[PDB]
Amino acid sequence: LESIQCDLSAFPGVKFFRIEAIFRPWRLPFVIDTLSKYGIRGLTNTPVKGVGVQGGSRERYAGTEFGPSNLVDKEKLDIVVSRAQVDAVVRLVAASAYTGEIGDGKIFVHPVAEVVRIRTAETGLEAEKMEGGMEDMMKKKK
Amino acid sequence: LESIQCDLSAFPGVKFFRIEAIFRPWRLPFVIDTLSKYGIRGLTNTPVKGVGVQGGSRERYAGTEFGPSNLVDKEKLDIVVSRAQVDAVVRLVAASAYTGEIGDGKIFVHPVAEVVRIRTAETGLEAEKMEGGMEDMMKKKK
Amino acid sequence: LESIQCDLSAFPGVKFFRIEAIFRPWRLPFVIDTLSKYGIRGLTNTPVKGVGVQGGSRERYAGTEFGPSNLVDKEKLDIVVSRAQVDAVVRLVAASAYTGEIGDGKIFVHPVAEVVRIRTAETGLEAEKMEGGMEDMMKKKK
Amino acid sequence: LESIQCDLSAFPGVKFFRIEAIFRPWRLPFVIDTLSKYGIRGLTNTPVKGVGVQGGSRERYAGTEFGPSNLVDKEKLDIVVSRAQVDAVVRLVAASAYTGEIGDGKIFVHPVAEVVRIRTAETGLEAEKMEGGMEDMMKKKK
Amino acid sequence: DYRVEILSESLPFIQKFRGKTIVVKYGGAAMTSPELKSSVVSDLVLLACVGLRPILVHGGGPDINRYLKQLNIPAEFRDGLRVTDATTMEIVSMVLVGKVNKNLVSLINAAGATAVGLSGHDGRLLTARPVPNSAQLGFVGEVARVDPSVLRPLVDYGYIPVIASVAADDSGQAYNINADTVAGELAAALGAEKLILLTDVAGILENKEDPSSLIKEIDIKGVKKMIEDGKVAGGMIPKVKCCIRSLAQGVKTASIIDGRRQHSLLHEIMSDEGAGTMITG
Amino acid sequence: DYRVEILSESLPFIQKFRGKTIVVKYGGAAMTSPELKSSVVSDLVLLACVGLRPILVHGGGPDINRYLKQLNIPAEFRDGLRVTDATTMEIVSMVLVGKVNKNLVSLINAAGATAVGLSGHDGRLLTARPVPNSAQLGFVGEVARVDPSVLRPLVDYGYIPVIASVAADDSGQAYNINADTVAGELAAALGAEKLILLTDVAGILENKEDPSSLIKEIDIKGVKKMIEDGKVAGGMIPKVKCCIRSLAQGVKTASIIDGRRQHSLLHEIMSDEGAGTMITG
Amino acid sequence: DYRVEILSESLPFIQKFRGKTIVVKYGGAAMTSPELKSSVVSDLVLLACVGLRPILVHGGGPDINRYLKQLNIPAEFRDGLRVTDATTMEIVSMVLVGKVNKNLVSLINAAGATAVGLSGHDGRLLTARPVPNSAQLGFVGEVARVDPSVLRPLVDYGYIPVIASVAADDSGQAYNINADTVAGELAAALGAEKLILLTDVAGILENKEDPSSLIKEIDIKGVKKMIEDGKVAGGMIPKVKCCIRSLAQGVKTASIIDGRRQHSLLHEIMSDEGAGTMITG
Amino acid sequence: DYRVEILSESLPFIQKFRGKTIVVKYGGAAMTSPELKSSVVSDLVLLACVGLRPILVHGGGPDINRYLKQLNIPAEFRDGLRVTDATTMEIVSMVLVGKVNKNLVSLINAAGATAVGLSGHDGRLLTARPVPNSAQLGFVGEVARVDPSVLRPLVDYGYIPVIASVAADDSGQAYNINADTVAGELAAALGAEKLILLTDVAGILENKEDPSSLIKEIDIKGVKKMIEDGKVAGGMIPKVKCCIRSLAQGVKTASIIDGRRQHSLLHEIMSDEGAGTMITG
Ligand SMILES: Nc1ncnc2c1ncn2[C@@H]1O[C@H](COP(=O)(O)OP(=O)(O)OP(=O)(O)O)[C@@H](O)[C@H]1O
Ligand SMILES: Nc1ncnc2c1ncn2[C@@H]1O[C@H](COP(=O)(O)OP(=O)(O)OP(=O)(O)O)[C@@H](O)[C@H]1O
Ligand SMILES: Nc1ncnc2c1ncn2[C@@H]1O[C@H](COP(=O)(O)OP(=O)(O)OP(=O)(O)O)[C@@H](O)[C@H]1O
Ligand SMILES: Nc1ncnc2c1ncn2[C@@H]1O[C@H](COP(=O)(O)OP(=O)(O)OP(=O)(O)O)[C@@H](O)[C@H]1O
Ligand SMILES: Nc1ncnc2c1ncn2[C@@H]1O[C@H](COP(=O)(O)OP(=O)(O)O)[C@@H](O)[C@H]1O
Ligand SMILES: Nc1ncnc2c1ncn2[C@@H]1O[C@H](COP(=O)(O)OP(=O)(O)O)[C@@H](O)[C@H]1O
Ligand SMILES: CC(=O)N[C@@H](CCC(=O)OP(=O)(O)O)C(=O)O
Ligand SMILES: CC(=O)N[C@@H](CCC(=O)OP(=O)(O)O)C(=O)O
Ligand SMILES: CC(=O)N[C@@H](CCC(=O)O)C(=O)O
Ligand SMILES: CC(=O)N[C@@H](CCC(=O)O)C(=O)O
Ligand SMILES: NC(=[NH2+])NCCC[C@H](N)C(=O)O
Ligand SMILES: NC(=[NH2+])NCCC[C@H](N)C(=O)O
Ligand SMILES: NC(=[NH2+])NCCC[C@H](N)C(=O)O
Ligand SMILES: NC(=[NH2+])NCCC[C@H](N)C(=O)O
Ligand SMILES: NC(=O)CC[C@H](N)C(=O)O
Ligand SMILES: NC(=O)CC[C@H](N)C(=O)O
Ligand SMILES: NC(=O)CC[C@H](N)C(=O)O
Ligand SMILES: NC(=O)CC[C@H](N)C(=O)O
Ligand SMILES: [Mg+2]
Ligand SMILES: [Mg+2]
Ligand SMILES: [Mg+2]
Ligand SMILES: [Mg+2]
Ligand SMILES: [Mg+2]
Ligand SMILES: [Mg+2]
User: Fold this and answer.
1) Chief subcellular site (chains E, F, G, H)?
2) Sign of torsion, CA G227 G231 G237 G239?
C-alpha cells in the first residue's frame, strides 16, 4: 500500500495528472489532514453516491446493507498534481482511507493538459505549484 | 442508437476510459438497473445542474420552460471501464435515458491512466474488473 | 488575462477538451451570462468545496478566515469545447470570475475523446456543436 | 386573622354560604392542601383576572408593576359550606394565601339556598355533607 | 478509582432540579479574584450542562468605585443605594456593561459554553422608573416592567444570559438599579424555582461584626424584624428586600451565600445543608 | 462537603460528550447480579441527565436457557450462536422482550427517568435476514436494515430507549439476532460516538493467561494483526468483529469493558484511563 | 366491472368517521387462527388508510394458559380475572408482550403499514395499582393513571400502536391488568370516539347457552341489571364493565362483536346494522 | 396633502430592497451631532418598518479619547489604528459597549422600535486574532470568525441589532477591532445586499482638492487602479479596502457617503442618485 505504483506509460509527455479518490464519508477529514501534513493543499471535494458491487456480497453503511442498484454515500476528492508527485499522493490517500472492508474506495488517475490560477494568470508549473507545498518542503529537507 | 460508435483513435495505447453521462433526474434508477442487468456495477452518481441551449428553443422541466442562463437539474453518472466495453456501455445509457425531447442529455468519453482498489491495493486490470461483472458474464456465456 | 494561452501540445490529435473552472459561488451567474453572450451554452455546474492554501495566508469567506484543512464553498463549471475554442473560453471565465483576492479560483483543461447527444445519436463534431453557438456566431460575423 | 369573624346577621334562617376567595395563583396548591387536611374537599377553582387598586400604589406580579385598569392574574376558589363551618374555612384560606403584600386577595361570603348531588338526588344537608369531611372528623375527635 | 462512586452519589440532587430555572446574582464584592471568578463561572456551566437553566445577574459596585476615584468623582451610598447624578450614571453604565458584563461573558465563552450579555435596554428587557426620593438619590431606578421575550429564544438556542442592572424609562432616560432588585424581579418574571444571591459574607449574620453568627435558615416575618431592629444594614438591605419581593411573587426559595467560598453555588444546590442562609416562610 | 469538589472535577468529561449518542450493550454477568443491574441503570440515568444520549441494548442468554430447560428443549449452541427452530424462536422472543426488556424499562422508570422498550419489529427498527449458516442455526438473523425513524421522536421527548435483539424479515418471519451485532449496527445507523460492550473480562490482553496484560487503547490495523497472529482468540473474536464493522461505518470509538466491576460504564466515560480496551478508527 | 359501484357506495360511511380515534380490543379468544388473525389486521390497516386513527389493544389468556400447562403451573379465574402470583406474572408478561404483541406488530408491518408495540411500562403509558382483594388475586392491577404522551408522536409519524395489558406501580412492581379494562381507560384517556371489543361470541347474549339470543342494542341500566341477574358472567364481566366506565368518561359508543366473523370490525363501523351488541344509554 | 403623493412615489424604491439585509456603519461626525444622531436612528427605524432588515455597527473614537485624556493615558494612533495596551482595552470596551452602544439602543427603543445591543463576545458573534502589527498596536484585532447564529432569532423576532466592535480570541483575551472592518465582515457573513459607511466626506473624488469631482458609481477593477494610480489616498484607502474585501465575499454593493448631511442613509437607499460613492462587484 505504502508502495503502489501507477502506470502513466500511455501518457508520455503529459506533465499533470488528476487523482480522483472516492471513499467513506467519515474518512474525509483524516485524508485531508494527511495530505496537508505532506504539503498537498490544493484539492476539491464533492459529496457523491456510488455502487461497487463485487460478486454477491453487500456493503454495510449506516448499519444497513446495500447491494446492486442501491446508491451509497461517499466523499470524492480531486487532486491535480505534477507527474513526479502522483505515486506519493495516491499512497497517502489509499493509506488514510483504508479500513479493510468492502466499499473502502477506488482511486482513478487522469491526464491533465493545463492549469491556470485566476488571480494571477499564472499557467502550467507556476499555476500548479503552491507556496509552502510538497515541492518546497522537499527543497527545505534537501 | 443501439449502434453508436465512439471514436477512441486519438488515444491509442490507452486501456481505460471514463463514460460521463448527464441526463434527466427521474431516469437515474432505470439507467442504473439497465447497467446492473448487463454487469456494470461500478459507477458514481453526482446530482448537477446544466444548460444545453440549442437555437431558441427552451426545455421544459417541472412544467416550466428554461432557456439561456437558467440552470436545470440533471443527474450525472461516471463509469470507468476498459476500452472494449466503451461502445456497449454508451449504448445502454443512451438507450435507457432517451425520451426524444430536448434536454435528454449528453455523454462524454474521457481517457483514464490508472485504476486502484483501496481495500486490496490492486491496480490496472485487476482493480477495474468486478467479480460477477460484464467480463465474467461473457465468459459464462462463451 | 484577456491573453492567456493554454498549452495543448502534449495532446496532438485531440479534438475536444474539458474546461473545468472552480471559483466563488456568487460569481456563478456573471460567468454563465458572459459565456451565454459569447455563444457558450452547453455547460455543467456542480457546487463543491475546496482548499487552496498558499503559504500561510488564509482566505476570507462569509466574513471568516479559512486555512489549512478548512473546506470552503466554491462553484464548479465543466465546459466541453473544441480545440479552437479553448483559449477564448478560458479567458472569458477567468476574466468574469476575477476579483483579485486569494481564493479567486483555478481552471484546469482536460482532454476529451468523444461527445454524444442522446436525443439524436449525433457524435463528435455534430454532437459538440450547438445551434446558435460560438461557431455559428463567427460565421454570421464573417 | 387566626380569629376573623364573619357577619351573617342579615341572613337569619339561611343554612348555606358560598365562600369565594380570590388570591395569588401560586398559592392555589397550598390553599387546597390546607383545606384538604381539615376536611374541606368540595371546592371549585376558576382562573380569573382582577384589579384591586388602593390609593396610588401598584402591585407587583411577574416582576412588573400593575396599576389602574391593568388586569392581573388570580386564582378563584368557591367553597359552599354550612353556616357553622364558615368562620373556620374563611380563616384557613386567609391564613394560607397570606403574604403581607398588596394584591394578597379578598374573600367574599354569599348566601346559598339549596344544594343537590346529581348522582344520588340528595338535597340540603345530605347533599352538602361529604363523607370523611370536617363534620365527620369533629365527631371522630369528640 | 473511587472518585466516580461520588459522582454517582450526586444523581438524586441533579434529578431534583432538572429542567428548572435558577437566577444567580454574582455580587460585585464576591469578584475578589480572577480565579474565584472563574470558579463561579465553572459552577454555572456545570449547572447548565447537568440540566438546570441558570441565569446570571451581576453587580459591580467596587469596580465602579475604583473608576470614580480615578476620575476624581465623589461617591455616596444611602441605605445600600448609590446616589447617582448624570455623570455618575454614565460611569455606572460604562463599568457594569462594558467591563463586568463582558468580562463574565468572555469567561463563560472560554469555559466551552456560550453567553449573551444584556442590559435592561437590550430588547427592552427592563423598564425603569424613578424612585420617590430621587430628590436625594438622583437617577436611581425601581423596576416598573420586565419583558422577558428577548430571553426566550436565547435560552432555546442554549445560550446563558448575563444581565447588567441598568435600564431606561419609556422616555429613554437611563437609571441605575440595584442588581439585587433586578435579580429578584427577573426571577419572578420567569417563575424561577430559585433566586440565589452570592455576596462577600457567610450569609445573613445575627450580628455583622461576628462571622460565626451565620443564620442558617429564616422566614419573612423574621428577616423584616432584622431590618427594623437594624441588624441588616447598608447593602444587605436591598438583598433581603429583593428576596422577599421575589418569594411573594412565587419564587419557591431564596438564598444568600458566600461568593468567595470555592464552589459555594454548587454546595447550595447539590446538598441538603446548603451554603448559607435560606429564606422562606 | 468534599463530595462537591469532585463533582466539579467531572465538568470536562461531561462537556466532552455533551449531546452525543452512545449505544451500550448489557449482557452476561453484570446482568444476573442485581447490584450490578441497578448500578448499571443508575449509570445510564446519570449519563442522560448529564447530557449524553444513551441507548441500551440487552442480551439475555442465561434466562432463555432456564426456560428451555423447564420445557425440556435444552439449548444448542454453535460458535456462540443459538440454534433456533420455530419453537425456540418463540421462547426467545418471549423472554427477551417480555421478561428482560420490560424488567429493565421498569427499573429505569423507577429510578426517576423514563424508558421505552423496543424490539426490532417495533417501528421496523431492524430488518433481519437469514445468517450465512441458516442451514444449521435455523432462524438466526443478520441485520439487513436499520430504520431509526422511530427513535428520533423518542429521544426528542427525552425517553431512554431499551432495545431487544429480535426482528423479522420483510415476509414477516421472526429471527433471533445476536445482541452485540444489533448494538453495533444500531450505533452505525445513528452515527454514535461510542459503542460500549459489557462483557465478563478486562477487555483485550496481550496474552490471555496474564490478566495484567490489558491493552488500554488500540486502532483497527493493530487489532486485525492480533486476530491474524492468534494473540487474542475465543469468545472475543466475534466481539472484536462487531467493533470493527461498526467503526468502519463511522462510529468514532468502541470499547469492551468489564461488566463485572461496579459502575464500569461510568468509569469508561468519566475517566481518561477508562475501564477496558478501547478501539479507535 | 360493477364491484366499483360498491366501493362508491361506502363514501358516506368513510366520511362519517374521518379523523376520529377508535380503540379496538382484539380478544385473545378471537385469535383462533393465523388467517382470522390476519383478516383482523387487514381491517385495521384499511381503517387507517381510509382516515380513521385506530389503536389496537390485545389480550392473550389462552396463549398464557397453554404455557402454564406446559410449565406445570395451576391456573384460576375469579369473576373473569386471573389469580396472579409472582411466577404467573412473569409468564403473563412473557406471553402477552413477547409473543402476542410482537406477533401482531409483525403482521401489520407485513401488511404494508407500520406498528409499534408497547406495554404499560413503555413511556409510562400506564401506571397500575393493586386491587383491594389482591389478598385473593395477587398481582392483579387496576389502572391508576394513563399518560398518553408517548402515543402522540407515534400517531403523528403515522405508526399504528399495539398495546399489551401489563404495567407497574410507581415502586416498580409488575401487575397483570385485564385487557378490556386497559382498552376502556385508554379510550377515555384519548377522548376516542369508539371502543370496540372483539371477542369469541356473537355479542352479549340474553342467555349464554344460545348463540341466537344476541342482544342487538342495550343501555347502561340494562346491562348492569344483566350482571346482577347473573346473565353476563366470567370474562364477559370486565367486558361490560369497561364499556360502562369508558362511556361515562365521554367515549360516545362502545360495541362488543364476534372476532371470528370475517371482517366483523368493518361491518361494525361501515354499516348501520353493525355486527354485534352496541352500548349507550 | 402633497406629503402623500410623494410617499406614493417611494414604492419602487421600497420594493426593490424588501427583505434584504443592510449593514450600516455609523461613525465620526454624524455621531457627535445630536441632530444627525436622532436623524440617523429615525432612518434606521423607517427602513425596518418599510421591510429592509438593517443592522447598525458603530464606532466611537472621539468619546474614547475623552476618557483617556481624563485618565492621563492619552490616545496613540498609527495609520488610523489605536495603540491598545491592556488598560486602554478596558477603557475602549467600557465606552463603546457601556456608553455608545447603549445610548443608541436607548434611542431606537424610544423611537418606537426595539434594539438589542451586542458586542462580538455576545453569542460569540465575532472571534478576533492579533492584527499583523500586534507588536506595535498591542491588542488590536482582525476578525478571524463571524458566527451569526445569535442574530437569526433576533431579526425573526423583529429586533434591530446594534453592534459594538470589540471581541475576544478563543483563549478569552479581548481585542479592539476597527468598526469599519467589523461592519464589512458582518455584511459578508450575512450575504447582505448593501454595506453603507457614514464618513465625513462626499465619498470618492477624481482629485481630492475639488469636492465636485465625486464619483457616483465604480466597480472593483476601477477603484483598485485608483489606489495604484494614487488618485485617492489618505484616510480613505482603508475604507476602500474593507469595501473590496466585503464585495469579494458576496456583498452586492458598498457605499461611502456623507454622514454630515441630514438623512444621508435615506438618500442613499431611496433615490437613484444616492448620497455618495457606490462600489459594485
Ligand atoms: N468503475 C468505476 N467507475 C466509477 N466509479 C466507481 C467504479 N468503481 C467504484 N466506483 C466508485 O467507488 C466507490 C467504492 O467502490 P468499492 O470500494 O465498492 O470498489 P470495489 O471495486 O467494489 O472494491 P471493494 O471490493 O473493496 O468494494 C463506489 O461506491 C463508486 O462510487
Ligand atoms: N458542451 C457541454 N459541456 C458540458 N456540459 C454539457 C455540454 N452540453 C450539454 N451539457 C450538459 O448536458 C445537459 C443536457 O444537454 P442537452 O440534452 O440540452 O444537450 P443538447 O446538445 O442541447 O441536446 P438537445 O438539443 O437534445 O437538448 C446540459 O443540461 C448540461 O448539463
Ligand atoms: N491542485 C488542485 N487540485 C484540485 N483543486 C484545486 C487545486 N488547486 C485549487 N483547487 C480548487 O480551486 C479552489 C481555488 O483555489 P485557489 O483560488 O485558492 O488557488 P490558489 O492556487 O491557492 O490561488 P490563490 O493563491 O489566488 O488562492 C480551491 O478551493 C479548490 O477547490
Ligand atoms: N370590590 C371587589 N369586587 C370584586 N372583586 C374584587 C373586589 N376587590 C378585589 N377584588 C378581586 O380580588 C383581587 C385581589 O384584591 P386585592 O388583594 O387588591 O384587594 P385590595 O382591596 O386592594 O387590598 P390590598 O390593599 O391588600 O391590595 C383583585 O385583583 C380582584 O380580582
Ligand atoms: N447582618 C448582616 N449580615 C451580613 N452582611 C451585612 C449585614 N448587615 C450589613 N451587611 C453588609 O452587607 C454587605 C452586602 O453586600 P454589598 O456591599 O451590597 O455587596 P454585593 O451586593 O456586591 O454582595 C456585606 O458586605 C456586609 O458588609
Ligand atoms: N351473556 C353472555 N354472553 C356472551 N358471552 C358470555 C356471557 N356470559 C359469559 N360469557 C363468556 O364471556 C367470554 C368473554 O370472553 P373472555 O373469555 O374473557 O375472552 P376475550 O376477553 O379473549 O374475548 C365468552 O367467551 C363467553 O364464553
Ligand atoms: C442468536 C443468538 O445467539 N441469540 C442470543 C441473544 C442474547 C445475547 O445476545 O446476550 P448474552 O451476552 O447475555 O448472551 C441467544 O439466543 O441467546
Ligand atoms: C482599533 C481601533 O482603532 N479601534 C477604534 C474603534 C472605533 C471606530 O472604529 O470608529 P470612528 O469612526 O468614530 O473612529 C478605536 O479604538 O478608536
Ligand atoms: C443604585 C445602585 O446601588 N446600583 C448599584 C448597581 C451595582 C450593584 O448592585 O452591585 C451600584 O453600585 O451603582
Ligand atoms: C388479570 C387478567 O385477567 N389478565 C388477563 C390479561 C389478558 C387478557 O385480558 O386477555 C389474563 O388473562 O391474565
Ligand atoms: N440553608 C440553606 N442554604 N439551605 C439550602 C437547601 C438546599 C437544597 N439543595 C435546595 O436547593 O433547596
Ligand atoms: N481505555 C479506555 N477504554 N478509555 C476510554 C477513553 C476515555 C474517555 N472517558 C472516553 O470515553 O473517551
Ligand atoms: N348494534 C350495533 N353494533 N350497532 C352499530 C352502529 C353502527 C354505526 N356504523 C356506528 O359505528 O355507530
Ligand atoms: N451613488 C450611489 N451610492 N447610489 C446608490 C444606488 C441607488 C439605490 N438607492 C441603491 O441603494 O441601490
Ligand atoms: N495539489 C497540490 O497541492 C499541488 C502542490 C504543488 N505540487 C507543490 O508541491 O507545491
Ligand atoms: N465499471 C464497471 O462496472 C467495470 C466492470 C468490469 N469491466 C467487469 O466487466 O468485470
Ligand atoms: N460548450 C459549448 O457551448 C460548445 C458550443 C459549440 N462549440 C458551438 O460553438 O456551436
Ligand atoms: N365543602 C365541603 O367540603 C363541605 C364539607 C361538609 N360540610 C362536611 O364536613 O362533611
Ligand atoms: Mg465494492
Ligand atoms: Mg439542450
Ligand atoms: Mg488559494
Ligand atoms: Mg389591591
Ligand atoms: Mg450591593
Ligand atoms: Mg378475557
Assistant:
1) plastid
2) negative
